[PDB]
Amino acid sequence: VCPNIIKRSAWEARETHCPKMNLPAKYVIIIHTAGTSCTVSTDCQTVVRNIQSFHMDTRNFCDIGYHFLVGQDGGVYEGVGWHIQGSHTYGFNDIALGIAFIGYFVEKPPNAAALEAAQDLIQCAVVEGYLTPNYLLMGHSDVVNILSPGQALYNIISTWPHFKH
Ligand code: NI
Ligand code: NI
């Protein structure tokens, strides 16, 4: 079953109304926040709240771009959640679930807790039906031209099942 998923009300998400997406998502994109990292709940919460505002205010997104985020606390934060579109990858925001690891992982990778959480969340995703049984996993930089999710992180995920080798 899905990990603890700390809801939007927890980190005080500015509430909005964004374009819902047809849930049988066919892909999974692993992206990294590229910004600061967090190790305790209260810190991750603040970072998530700020990524949303930035995304809405200066990026002009409808809400935070990611469906879910993962902190070094091993906690899984709801982004826009399952039922909403994302603003994370071009032409995939309505068909790919974007999971953002909070922090910067080009050299060093997320800890084992952060990683275990993503895979557990991905699993229930396929199990619950939010992901097609034959969905395809891939890195952010595999679809668009971006320095994400970082070598370290990339090398780990390329290891996971259904990864688009
Ligand atoms: Ni599970
Ligand atoms: Ni474990």
UniProtKB/Swiss-Prot annotation:
Induction: Up-regulated by exposure to Gram-positive and Gram-negative bacteria. Pattern receptor that binds to murein peptidoglycans (PGN) of Gram-positive bacteria. Has bactericidal activity towards Gram-positive bacteria. May kill Gram-positive bacteria by interfering with peptidoglycan biosynthesis. Also binds to Gram-negative bacteria, and has bacteriostatic activity towards Gram-negative bacteria. Plays a role in innate immunity. It comes from Homo sapiens (Human). Disulfide bonds join 2-124, 18-62, 38-44. Residues 24-149 form the N-acetylmuramoyl-L-alanine amidase domain. Residues 88-93 are annotated as: Interaction with murein. It comes from the Eukaryota. Detected in skin epidermis, eccrine sweat glands and ducts, ciliary body epithelial cells of the eye, in small intestine, colon, stomach and in mature epithelial cells of the tongue (at protein level). Highly expressed in skin and esophagus, expressed also in tonsils and thymus and to a much lesser extent in the stomach, descending colon, rectum and brain. N-glycosylated. This is Peptidoglycan recognition protein 3. Monomer. Homodimer; disulfide-linked. Heterodimer with PGLYRP4; disulfide-linked. One of its GO terms (cellular component) is membrane. Its main location: secreted. GO terms for molecular function: N-acetylmuramoyl-L-alanine amidase activity; peptidoglycan binding; peptidoglycan immune receptor activity; protein heterodimerization activity; zinc ion binding. Belongs to the N-acetylmuramoyl-L-alanine amidase 2 family. Peptidoglycan binds at residues 55, 59, 66. Keywords: Antibiotic, Antimicrobial, Disulfide bond, Glycoprotein, Immunity, Innate immunity, Repeat, Secreted, Signal. GO terms for biological process: antimicrobial humoral immune response mediated by antimicrobial peptide; biological process involved in interaction with host; defense response to bacterium; defense response to Gram-positive bacterium; detection of bacterium; immune response; innate immune response; killing of cells of another organism. It is found in: Secreted.
